[PDB]
Design a protein around this ligand. Structure first.
Ligand SMILES: Cc1cc2nc3c(=O)[nH]c(=O)nc-3n(C[C@H](O)[C@H](O)[C@H](O)COP(=O)(O)O)c2cc1C
Ligand SMILES: O=C(NCC(c1ccccc1)c1ccccc1)c1nsnc1O
Ligand SMILES: O=C(O)c1cc(=O)[nH]c(=O)[nH]1
Length: 379
C-alpha cells in the first residue's frame, strides 16, 4: 500500500535524507515526483467539525501548505492530495530570479528547525501563471479538487525600486486565478523588503493592491469568459504576511492600518532573524523556521488578535507540528493553519497525522467544532 501517506518506508527514507542529503536537493526531488503523480495521497474524509472559513473561503480542513514550498506552482495537485485543504504558491515576482547562492537551506533535526536564505527564487509571474492556469483546468474536471483553495504570495524582484509596481504587475497577470493574494512584506532575504511594514508604506501598499484588484474586476467582468477562474469564483481576498521581528509600537501601528484598509486577513508570521542559539546554524544567514519559532509566532498572534480588536482573521504560520500546536494557534486567534517545517521533519504523513490529532483534541477539550475554539484563549 505505497499510496498511503503513512506507509512505513517513507519515514525511513526521510530520516536518511535529513541526515545525509542537501536540504534543497531533497525538496527538488519531492517536487519532481509530484509532477508525475506518484506521491502517496490521503483518501480520508475530513471531519466537517474541523472545517473553517475566512469570509467566503471555505476550508475543508484547517491545514494548508505555507508559501515557498511550491514557489512555482508545479506541484499543486500532489501536495493538496496529501490531505491539505489549501496551498499558498509563491512567493512570485514579475521577472524570474535564481535567488541567492546555494547551498542556502539547512535543517537541524534535533531542534526541528530550518534556516534559509533563498531570496525569492521563482520562474517569474508569467510562467507561474501558466502553471496555475494548468491546475485550474485540471481542477475543473477533477471534482475531487473542486473545493481546494490556492492563494498566491506576491513580492518584488530584488532590484525593483517601487514595490507597488511589482505587486500591481502580479495582480494583473495572476490575480484572476487566485482565491486570495498574500502580500509578502516580510521575507528577511530580499534587502529592504521589511521596511515596507512601516505604517505609511504598508497602508499605501494595501490600498494600491486592493485598487488594482478592484480595477481588474471593473474592467473585465463584462467579458464573455468569466473573470474569476479560481475556486471561489469571486475576486481574490487580500492578506498581508508579517515578520515576527517587530517591536510593540510597530505592531500596534500596523494593526491600526490593517483596520483602516480592511485587509481580509493577516498571515502570522514569516521566519525570524532573532534566533542564534542553534550551533549548527551559527555561521548561517537568513530566516529561521520550525519549533524554535512556535512560541514567538503564537504570542505574536495573541498581540495582533487584540491589537486589531479581533476584527481581522488570522492565518497561523510558525512551528506547527502537532495537533496541540495547531490548537494553541487557533485558541490564540488563528482561523486556519499553514505548515512548512512539519512537512520537512514529519514527511508524507504530515497532514493525515495532524488532522487526526486535532480531531481527538477537539473531543478531549469539549469543543463542538473548530470554529468554537477560535480566539478562546481571550475569553
Ligand atoms: C526554504 C523556505 C522557503 C520559504 N519561502 C517563502 C516564500 O517564498 N514566501 C513566504 O511568504 N514565506 C516563505 N517561507 C516561510 C514559510 O512560509 C513559513 O512562514 C515559515 O517556514 C514558518 O513556518 P514553519 O515554522 O512551519 O516552517 C519559506 C520557508 C522556508 C524554510
Ligand atoms: O529534507 C527535506 N525534505 C525531505 C523530503 C523527503 C521526503 C520523503 C523521503 C525523503 C525525503 C521531503 C520533501 C517534501 C516534503 C516532506 C519531505 C527538506 N529540507 S529543506 N526543504 C525540504 O523539503
Ligand atoms: O525566498 C525566500 O528567501 C524567503 C521568503 C520568505 O518570505 N520567507 C523565508 O523564510 N524565505
Amino acid at each position: 500500500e505505497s499510496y498511503n501517506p503513512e506507509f512505513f518506508l517513507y519515514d525511513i527514507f526521510l530520516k536518511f535524507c535529513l541526515k545525509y542529503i542537501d536540504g534543497e536537493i531533497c525538496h527538488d526531488l519531492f517536487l519532481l515526483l509530484g509532477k508525475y503523480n506518484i506521491l502517496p495521497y490521503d483518501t480520508s474524509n475530513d471531519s466537517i467539525y474541523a472545517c473553517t472559513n475566512i469570509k467566503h473561503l471555505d476550508f475543508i480542513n484547517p491545514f494548508g501548505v505555507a508559501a515557498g514550498f511550491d514557489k512555482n506552482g508545479v506541484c499543486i495537485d500532489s501536495i493538496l492530495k496529501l490531505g491539505f485543504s489549501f496551498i499558498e504558491i509563491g512567493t512570485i515576482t514579475p521577472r524570474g530570479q535564481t535567488g541567492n547562492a546555494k547551498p542556502r537551506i539547512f535543517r537541524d533535526v534535533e531542534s526541528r528547525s530550518i534556516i534559509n536564505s533563498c531570496g525569492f527564487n521563482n520562474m517569474g509571474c508569467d510562467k507561474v501563471t501558466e502553471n496555475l492556469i494548468l491546475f485550474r483546468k485540471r481542477q475543473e474536471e477533477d471534482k475531487l479538487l473542486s473545493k481546494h483553495i490556492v492563494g498566491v504570495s506576491i513580492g518584488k524582484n530584488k532590484d525593483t525600486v517601487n514595490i507597488v509596481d511589482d505587486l500591481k504587475y502580479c495582480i494583473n497577470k495572476i490575480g484572476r486565478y487566485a482565491d486570495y493574494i498574500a502580500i509578502n512584506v516580510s521575507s528577511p532575504n530580499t534587502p529592504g523588503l521589511r521596511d515596507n511594514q512601516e505604517a505609511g508604506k504598508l497602508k499605501n501598499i494595501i490600498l494600491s493592491v486592493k485598487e488594482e484588484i478592484d480595477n481588474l474586476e471593473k474592467n473585465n467582468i463584462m467579458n464573455d469568459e468569466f473573470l474569476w477562474f479560481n475556486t471561489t469564483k469571486k475576486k481574490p481576498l487580500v492578506f498581508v504576511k508579517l515578520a515576527p521581528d517587530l517591536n510593540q509600537e510597530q505592531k500596534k501601528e500596523i494593526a491600526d492600518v490593517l483596520l483602516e484598509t480592511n485587509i481580509d486577513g493577516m498571515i502570522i508570521s514569516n521566519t525570524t532573524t532573532q534566533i542564534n542559539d542553534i550551533k549548527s546554524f551559527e555561521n548561517k544567514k537568513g530566516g529561521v523556521s520550525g519549533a524554535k519559532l512556535k512560541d514567538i509566532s503564537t504570542k505574536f498572534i495573541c498581540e495582533m488578535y487584540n491589537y486589531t480588536n479581533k476584527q481581522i482573521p488570522i492565518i497561523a504560520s510558525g512551528g506547527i507540528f502537532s495537533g496541540l500546536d495547531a490548537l494553541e494557534k487557533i485558541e490564540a486567534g488563528a482561523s486556519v493553519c499553514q505548515l512548512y517545517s512539519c512537512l520537512v521533519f514529519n514527511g508524507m504523513k504530515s497532514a493525515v497525522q495532524i488532522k487526526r490529532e486535532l480531531n481527538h483534541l477537539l473531543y478531549q477539550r469539549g469543543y463542538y467544532n473548530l470554529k468554537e475554539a477560535i480566539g478562546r484563549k481571550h475569553s
